[PDB]
Design an enzyme around this catalytic site. Structure first.
Site, short mmCIF file in Angstrom:
data_model
loop_
_atom_site.label_atom_id
_atom_site.label_comp_id
_atom_site.label_asym_id
_atom_site.label_seq_id
_atom_site.Cartn_x
_atom_site.Cartn_y
_atom_site.Cartn_z
N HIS B 41 -5.70 103.00 15.35
CA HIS B 41 -4.25 102.85 15.42
C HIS B 41 -3.58 102.68 14.05
O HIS B 41 -2.36 102.64 14.00
CB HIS B 41 -3.78 101.77 16.41
CG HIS B 41 -4.10 100.35 16.04
ND1 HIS B 41 -3.42 99.69 15.03
CD2 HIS B 41 -4.97 99.49 16.62
CE1 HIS B 41 -3.93 98.47 14.99
NE2 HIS B 41 -4.87 98.30 15.92
N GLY B 143 -1.52 91.87 11.02
CA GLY B 143 -2.32 92.25 9.87
C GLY B 143 -3.80 91.93 10.01
O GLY B 143 -4.60 92.29 9.14
N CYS B 145 -5.78 93.16 12.37
CA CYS B 145 -6.52 94.28 12.97
C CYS B 145 -7.58 94.80 12.02
O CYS B 145 -7.32 94.91 10.82
CB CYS B 145 -5.59 95.39 13.44
SG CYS B 145 -4.26 94.84 14.55
C1 LIG Z 1 1.76 96.71 13.66
N1 LIG Z 1 0.96 96.90 14.85
C2 LIG Z 1 -0.02 96.07 15.19
O1 LIG Z 1 -0.28 95.06 14.55
C3 LIG Z 1 -0.88 96.51 16.36
C4 LIG Z 1 -0.55 95.81 17.70
C5 LIG Z 1 -1.25 94.44 17.88
O2 LIG Z 1 -1.53 94.03 18.99
N2 LIG Z 1 -1.45 93.71 16.76
C6 LIG Z 1 -1.88 92.37 16.68
C7 LIG Z 1 -3.21 91.97 16.81
N3 LIG Z 1 -3.64 90.70 16.77
C8 LIG Z 1 -2.72 89.75 16.61
C9 LIG Z 1 -1.33 89.99 16.46
C10 LIG Z 1 -0.38 88.97 16.28
C11 LIG Z 1 0.94 89.27 16.11
C12 LIG Z 1 1.37 90.59 16.12
C13 LIG Z 1 0.49 91.61 16.31
C14 LIG Z 1 -0.90 91.35 16.49
C15 LIG Z 1 0.93 95.38 17.84
C16 LIG Z 1 1.75 96.39 18.62
O3 LIG Z 1 1.20 96.70 19.92
C17 LIG Z 1 -0.15 96.95 19.95
C18 LIG Z 1 -0.60 97.64 21.06
C19 LIG Z 1 -1.87 98.18 21.06
C20 LIG Z 1 -2.67 98.01 19.95
CL1 LIG Z 1 -4.28 98.68 19.96
C21 LIG Z 1 -2.25 97.30 18.85
C22 LIG Z 1 -0.98 96.73 18.84
#
Ligand SMILES: CNC(=O)C[C@@]1(C(=O)Nc2cncc3ccccc23)CCOc2ccc(Cl)cc21
Ligand SMILES: CNC(=O)C[C@@]1(C(=O)Nc2cncc3ccccc23)CCOc2ccc(Cl)cc21
Lengths: 301, 305
Positions: B41, B143, B145
């Site tokens: 992603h 951040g 991920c």
């Molecule tokens: C900028 N996009 C992302 O960071 C990816 C994101 C995600 O969940 N990131 C995060 C993972 N772990 C802790 C988080 C704490 C707060 C915010 C984000 C966090 C956010 C957007 O919806 C999704 C949906 C599917 C998938 Cl596979 C990834 C994501």
């Protein structure tokens, strides 16, 4: 989101763990630059544990009596000195893995990571707090002496603890990296007892703020309290007094969540009176006191 | 003495953490040999994330679109491929800090250490268990991920997890290092929910053995139970079934403490029907289920890495 008891990454400390042997005793040492630090009790024999005269025992030792092993490489000791309860073994090689570091003495309530080691080999890492009675509730077996407590500031390792002993209650006592014991403990097998422990109130409040940041609000109430009324209630549940310093330290979390410190103090009073009633706060049924206000901000923001 | 939630030393993994940037998205990557692994992603925008065609998005990317940073050194990407939900960025340099490693897929109940990273920089290490609902109750901010889960066996790192997303309840979902998600999750912005979680029964029993080893014996009772009677009770309290494999795995702790597994099961049965009654076990008022039988043995024996 999420809240976990989290230790600092231990890699910078792993590269400093060595095995220090003196006679039949083997423990861990911390190799920084050309010095290996370890508990001075490594020089003690069987009848030198009740009343060791460390100055006398050390004068009888030579550099070749200390066997230092870094991985499968034997380091050569070129000097030895004692600083309080820590032995400093000057070696003929500066540790190439020496990180940027400082020796910091911490106060009760402060948290740090512990890299538990056996025979100079790191086996695990966990997060600890310096209890108000100056002990740490660690997880240590025989051979763990010399395992260190640390925090990481950007790329700098602040070494705050070195493990020396286990008290009869299973709690642990140790020193800062200058050999000064935390607490009224001595490095002797003489009868020693950890004082009655108390809860680190400022840390519980910081953890209640972490819970509010994570959406857990059930414990909040419409009450506020005076600092004095809070401390009178807190003392009755063996909680440390909350000072104005603690109130100020909680300022940023209070501003972030919109819940005044004395407002959160009233929630804490209520929690202490009622218990949790089958509910949990951040997956815990007890009030967590091993997260400082600094830890909460670091982990949440 | 003492019993703590303890992670594996993270040094071998720290030397593999790099920062991967694609456009405006920055996350972490795992640099092993000449390959950098990260969540696929990283190639998504906000619109793309809603309904992503990763094959289509990846074909439009070139090697120079992926900015990989190992410390303050920029690595040059010489190839890119996708394996399930993980992106593999072939780089020109083999990581000199590459440890002995394997990619292992774990089962629910198994624990592992998470090295939480931001901008390719490790900030924390914690232990956790793969929940029976395939989520992990981690601690992750934006951040994180690409942060990985691992175990250490001798001098070999077994990478078992890579963080991809956070579910609405604050729990986390991710994949193994081959990009296969743990759980019925997908890497897209869509309504996804963690299933009802259950307690890892074998882990609670292992933790009760750790408590006995540490001198906490109040919960022990004279009673024993059949495996079937225990599982009928356990199913009622949302506890995972205990298999004969689990009983066998608890064998060494059963021998060390002199408490048969079915004997400990009757203690657990009473703890479920009656509670702790104001008492704690290893300083906890809840039954801890994130220590496997191997974790208990490792911590109560001092195995090193
Ligand atoms: C900028 N996009 C992302 O960071 C990816 C994101 C995600 O969940 N990131 C995060 C993972 N772990 C802790 C988080 C704490 C707060 C915010 C984000 C966090 C956010 C957007 O919806 C999704 C949906 C599917 C998938 Cl596979 C990834 C994501
Ligand atoms: C051989 N000598 C030692 O082990 C040191 C010793 C000690 O406490 N070691 C240990 C430290 N931490 C966890 C332990 C778990 C079990 C057993 C030993 C453990 C044991 C003997 O009494 C003292 C008294 C003073 C001092 Cl400063 C050190 C010690």
């Amino acid at each position: 989101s999420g809240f976990r008891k989290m230790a600092f990454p231990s890699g910078k400390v792993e590269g400093c763990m060595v095995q220090v042997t003196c006679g039949t005793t083997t423990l861990n040492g911390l190799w920084l630059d050309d010095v290996v630090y370890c508990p001075r009790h490594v020089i003690c024999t069987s009848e030198d544990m009740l009343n060791p005269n460390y100055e006398d025992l050390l004068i009888r030792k030579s550099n070749h009596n200390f066997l230092v092993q870094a991985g499968n490489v034997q380091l050569r000791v070129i000097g030895h000195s004692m600083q309080n309860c820590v032995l400093k073994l000057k070696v003929d090689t500066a540790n190439p893995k020496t990180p940027k570091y400082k020796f910091v003495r911490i106060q009760p309530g402060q948290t740090f990571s512990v890299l538990a080691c056996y025979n100079g080999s790191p086996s695990g890492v966990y997060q600890c707090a310096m209890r108000p009675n100056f002990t740490i509730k660690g997880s240590f077996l025989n051979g763990s002496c010399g395992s260190v407590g640390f925090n990481i500031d950007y790329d700098c390792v602040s070494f705050c603890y070195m493990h020396h002993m286990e008290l009869p209650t299973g709690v642990h006592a140790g020193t800062d990296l200058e050999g000064n014991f935390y607490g009224p403990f001595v490095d002797r097998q003489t009868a020693q007892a950890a004082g009655t422990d108390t809860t680190i109130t400022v840390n519980v409040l910081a953890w209640l703020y972490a819970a509010v940041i994570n959406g857990d609000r059930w414990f909040l109430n419409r009450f506020t309290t005076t600092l004095n009324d809070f401390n009178l209630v807190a003392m009755k549940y063996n909680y440390e007094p909350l000072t104005q310093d603690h109130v100020d330290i909680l300022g940023p979390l209070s501003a972030q969540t919109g819940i005044a410190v004395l407002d959160m103090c009233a929630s804490l009073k209520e929690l202490l009176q009622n218990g949790m009633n089958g509910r949990t706060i951040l997956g815990s049924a007890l009030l967590e006191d091993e997260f400082t206000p600094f830890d909460v901000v670091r982990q949440c923001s």
